A paper describes a structure:
The lipid-enveloped bacteriophages of the Cystoviridae family infect Gram-negative bacteria, mainly plant-pathogenic Pseudomonas species and share similarities with the members of the Reoviridae family, including bluetongue virus and rotavirus. Their genome of ∼14 kb consists of three dsRNA segments small (S), medium (M) and large (L), which are sequentially encapsidated as ssRNA precursors into the icosahedrally symmetric procapsid by the packaging NTPase P4 (15–23). P4 is a protein of ∼35 kDa, which can assemble into a hexameric ring. NTP-binding sites are located on the external perimeter of the ring at the interfaces between adjacent subunits, whereas the nucleic acid binding sites are found in the central channel. P4 proteins are the only known RNA-specific helicases belonging to helicase Superfamily 4 (SF4).
The ɸ8 P4 N-terminal domain is composed of two helices separated by a four-stranded antiparallel β-sheet. In P4 ɸ8, the strand following the arginine fingers motifs does not extend as far as the ATP-binding site but instead climbs back along the side of the hexamer (partially disordered) to re-emerge into as C-terminal helix at the top of the hexamer, followed by a loop that dives into the central channel restricting its diameter by more than half (see later in the text for more discussion on the C-terminal domain). However, in ɸ8 P4, these residues are displaced >8 Å from that position and therefore cannot contribute to catalysis. This suggests that in ɸ8 P4, extensive conformational changes occur as a consequence of nucleotide and/or oligonucleotide binding, which render the enzyme competent for catalysis. Although the L2 loop of ɸ8 P4 contains hydrophilic residues (DDENVD), it does not project a lysine side chain towards the central channel. Nevertheless, the L1 loop contains a motif (LKK) that has been shown to be crucial for RNA binding. The first lysine of this motif (K185) is found in the equivalent position to K241 of ɸ12 P4 and is also seen interacting with D220 of loop L2. We therefore postulate that K185 (loop L1) in ɸ8 P4 plays the same role in RNA binding as K241 (loop L2) in ɸ12 P4, and that the coupling of the movement of the L1 and L2 loops to ATP hydrolysis via motion of helix 6, as proposed for ɸ12, may be a general feature of all P4 molecules. As the C-terminal domain is (i) necessary for ATP hydrolysis (data not shown), (ii) restricts the diameter of the central channel and (iii) blocks the interface through which RNA is thought to be loaded, we postulate that the C-terminal region needs to be displaced by RNA for ring opening and subsequent ATP hydrolysis to occur. Thus, it appears that ɸ8 P4 has developed a specific mechanism to regulate ATPase activity and couple it with ssRNA binding such that RNA displaces the C-terminal domain, to allow ATP hydrolysis to occur.
Numbering used by the authors:
A (entry chain H), B (entry chain J), C (entry chain K), D (entry chain L), E (entry chain G), F (entry chain I): 12 to 184, 190 to 280, 289 to 300, 303 to 314
């Protein structure tokens, strides 16, 4: 039992979405058949629906997706059960590991992932919107990874990081940030998955002021809000002081955490050779 | 007799509006046949009309809906009578429960709803634009809920909250806020319903300064304006000092309030499998 | 002899303009046959012409209506005579009743209207852009009301208020405000009607500074400029100190005013049931 | 011999431009046959050409009119001679009568016009962008008046005022103002006409600071720049201290000026009754 | 031997570009056959190519011209030789005569032009973006003049001024200014011409601060950068202190300069009479 | 063995991309057959794919390229080996030579290139976004040069400079800068090439503050980050103090560096003569 990296699976899915008319849909996919989940997300004014491993199709409704459905949700029939989450008494929902100038956001994610993997849980980690990682970390990349994990036999998913999503919703210039964090927790509950998100507002002017106000938001919207107060590396080993919030505890708690340093094109080429290249027409490409 | 939650009914209606050409209309609906009401709202420059349980259709007039009709209204023939509102001497119109840093906006809404339900009134509550709630809380979601309650046997409707509507009209950067609050009260009178709205400008920079100026606006535009001055939780029990305005009293009144803590996908999947996906054409999707 | 309320007549006209292609025009109307007046207004870059009770049609000229015609005017053939205005020696033109923090804008309008009605004049009052009033108060709603009164046997028209028109032209962030106030006075003279407009820049940051600069503008552009300096309610009775300007008096005059408190869907449903719904095509809906 | 008012002639020409496809052109006009002049102006990215009394046609070039031709010019073949300007030794070119808080811009224009009319010159005056005047005063209205006077037997033209043109080019928030003032002087020379323009930046925040910088600009770009320093009315009579610049005098001169107070729909209706109403198509209406 | 003025030749070329579909091209031109040069410039996202006297055609590539080609260049086959530039040892490249509050930009240009004309060089001068001059001075007007001189027997070209080009690239609110100045020098070298440009940031808020930073930019990008430090007129005669930079001299040098005051529609009418007027279609007119 | 300049090869490729419909693609190219690499980049919402010497084709996906793929990557099958990089123990990846007010960015690039060329490596240098250089330096020009070097027998590529790319992503007004620097390093690793980038934020207001924050970013995202602290020229010879970062060294190191001063249209004309000119249609030209 080891941690599965969804990054390449998300990358190759983005390669397939770039080569076809999404209104017609991308059929004969193999995203996962373990759970019968349907992810519905907003891409600007368009809706992009991920059918449970069958298909991914886009719709352009007469009215904006922002008014109609907001951010995005997950629907499942008949049901979704994560037997191992019950076994290990791990509640479904979203967690936010947030750090400022102290850093150690990625280190702690790797620590908690390997720890969860050791306990017998099926752990998945997606790398995005950070240095040395190929995924740009867009809202589409988060929902693609979320769906890929949801429909598959994944119990705990680690999304590192939401840096691009935060910037995309103009978090560096917030209602939109709240709606996103609520939707991500709502999603994790509906899919009955434990999703652990990470964020460092390093693109923001006042990094630490953004950390406290985002942590206060995360505390209300998400199941767990974890703030890295301090972080120090000692060769292989690390140690970090953490502030943790669990809804609905009106009391916050300090939580020390230490351990060892745990470390983590065929589709497009095929298109280029065959002219199958205007599949948008009069509608401008949408972006969330 | 218990409180009915309109949230899922609004959610499934949004699912049907996202899957069809609204110019043609969404027919064979079952919104309600108790009252013969027609809701007419603005979505950008478009008009979205809710026929009384028959149908929901959109029009794209030659001139903007903003100039033509402004926000939105309700028309009814022949008449609308809420016998229980006369019985319990409850005047039709809109109420605004507004709070700042003190909070307790949701708690008081739940308190007043259960209290109204106990008196024998048909109470409906719609959850939106807040943490742990699926509805994003758009203007469309407010008018959808308003119509669903209007055409049904609902005497008192609780809309918690207008946080997204407030942000949508740029209340965080107001004439547009005034027009909305007036239209909502005008609607509640035309439909002969008691609609109780809630707001907390928590996305605003100066929260308490926004509370006083919105409360002053609400006092003129709506039947009742309720400002939560203070709020404290004592285990199960709560207590709050409230400032209340009733038009046209040139005198405001303090009003103490205490009690116990009262607590509150098939359509889209069917579309994804069948290519029925450009139903907008040359006109850009509208948003209010 | 009593005051006629044009509000519902304007509302039902807006209902007819929302349901048809205005390029083709709205025929078989009954706006009024007393005077042969034609109202020509600008809606963005489009021109909306009101024929004298026959018809209302829109044109989309090759060049902007803003360059071509500016705001709006009235043309009449052969002539327009208001016999009662001569009888009571009331000059045709526009008047602006403006107030700040003192208020009493609506009270004085009701006072002057009932007073004019008592003298034997045919008085019409249109309610817009204010609390408890259905009309949103757009530029289209002002010109609709102006034309409806113009073609009918109306001698004095009271437009309360221009709050939305002021905001529409960005008066809260002015050349556009000047052009509007001049056009409204020019209109009232061309139609040979006494139109009394009201304004309170309550949406403006510095309300009283806006009052003095708008009153100075009104003094030059309009026949009468009335500034409510003070206002106090004494049960039924009211009293207000007023500053009045008449062009071209280089001297202003104080004017005390006291008295008693005087108080003031079938078309759309028919459309919804019959698919007659894209009547704009490639041209975006215009807004002034 | 009296002063001719071009205002109504400009108004009725705007009525004809609003009712036809300008790409096809407005033929069988009678603007004037005295001189063989062609006015070429910019309306956004479009070019609107006035043939010498024959015709007015619009072109939509592949590239913007702003890059291609800038503001506007006049071309004439074979030649244009104003015999009376030689007789009375009046140089062709543009003059700018500018005033601030002192006012008396209109009074002096009326004084100089009647004075020029007395000397035997053919004087024309166009009223625009000011109170009690129907013309909105757009760039199109200036060039329409300029052409109508140019092709006719007019020696001196008074354009009161350029207030709207100044606001249109964003003079109240300048290169665009310079280009306009240079083009207007260049035009008057090419047409061999004496055009006297007037301006009061009363819509500007700091009125007097705008007066000095616009007067400094006018001094370089135009033949004569006249700044009204002071102005006072004494019943019928007036007196004003004036600063005058003539290029290329490196010395300015004071110039006292006193005297008496000198004072100054069928086409559209025909269209409304006959559906001749989309004549723009895919190109958005242009505005300068 | 005298100085040739390209202004009218540029003006009549702009008249031909405004009357045809540039995608088809403007054929049978007589721009010059002395040198086989092709000017390629950017007009927004479009590319406007000037073939060497044959033709001027525009292309609308799938991707923006800004990404593809940046500003503009010149290509020549087989070769371009200016025998007189070798004779008089004048290096090919661009020169920038820049002045602030001191002025004398035009005077020095006229002085250096007549001086170059006296030495036996073929001198051309184009007048633009300044008072008493018909050309508006756009980027298109600069490249039109550059090409007309390039293909003709011109050794030294004087472009007075780049005031409009500077404003066009938002120099008054810079990377875009740098790219333009580099492209103009690159052009002059490729065409083997001596082009002398002039600029006065008189539309800028802080004129002299803009002079020093533009002179520092010009020093790196162009062959010669000439800053007019002081300037004084003494009747006919003038004198000016100048700072001069030649790349790559670390050291700047002062350079005194004195002397005498040297002083400097058929196509469109033909179109108006013949309907040949939509030649753009769905693509919006481009502007640089 | 000498340094190859890719500038003209990039220039002639841009000439071919400007003359055809990129949706159809540009076939029969000879970019390089040494390595089987495919470059995939984003141009606004469009994707521009460079097949390994065969072809360059553009796609316009239903959803934005920014959400789908972010910046750009390289895919290669079966494999890419740079035997000389192993021989000389030079790791594949991106390097950033950054300087502020000290300069000497170009001098050091020329020094390191000639040094690498002496060691036996195949060195390529592309000149862009700087004075005396024809390439404007856009994102397209960087990826064009990157691909041309990648598919060819190039071991070390010097891109001088990223000044335009930095401005293009709004670095002078950052998440977008981070994503670009990460993608460029990711690219260099995937292609197994040593790419050395250069930057001087000379268009930025505070040049040196931008240098420290970009160097801190480069330190995390790229293999090597080189900051020029000081630089002085002594005739032929130069000397510079440098701060160098190698990931993942938590210690920075000073590094002195001295040496001698080392110094560095047919396709378009063919198009102009033959009308092959609307190849975009309804989709607006994209720009990154």
């Amino acid at each position: 039992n080891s941690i599965i990296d969804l990054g390449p699976r998300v990358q190759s899915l983005m390669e397939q979405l770039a080569t076809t008319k999404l209104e017609e849909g991308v059929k004969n996919l193999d995203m996962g058949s373990v759970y019968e989940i349907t992810t519905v997300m907003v891409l600007g004014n368009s809706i992009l629906g991920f059918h449970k491993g069958d298909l991914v199709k886009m719709v352009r409704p007469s009215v904006s997706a922002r008014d109609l459905i907001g951010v995005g949700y997950a629907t499942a029939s008949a049901a979704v059960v994560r037997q191992r989450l019950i076994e290990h008494k791990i509640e479904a929902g979203a967690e936010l590991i947030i750090s400022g100038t102290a850093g150690g956001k990625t280190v702690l994610t790797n620590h908690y992932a390997a720890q969860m993997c050791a306990k017998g849980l099926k752990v998945a980690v997606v790398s995005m919107a950070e240095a040395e990682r190929p995924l740009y970390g867009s809202v589409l990349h988060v929902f693609a990874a979320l769906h890929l994990a949801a429909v598959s036999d994944v119990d705990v998913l680690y999304v590192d990081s939401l840096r691009s999503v935060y910037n995309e919703l103009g978090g560096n210039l917030s209602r939109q940030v709240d709606g996103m964090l609520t939707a991500l927790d709502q999603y994790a509950r509906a899919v009955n998955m434990r999703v652990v998100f990470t964020l460092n507002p390093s693109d923001d002017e006042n990094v630490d002021a953004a950390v406290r106000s985002v942590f206060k938001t995360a505390s209300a919207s998400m199941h767990t809000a974890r703030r890295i107060k301090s972080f120090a590396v000692n060769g292989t080993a690390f140690t970090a002081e953490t502030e943790i919030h669990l809804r609905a505890d009106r009391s916050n708690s300090a939580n020390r955490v230490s351990g060892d340093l745990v470390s983590r094109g065929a589709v497009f080429n095929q298109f280029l050779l065959s002219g199958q290249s205007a599949f948008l027409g009069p509608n401008i490409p949408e972006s969330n």
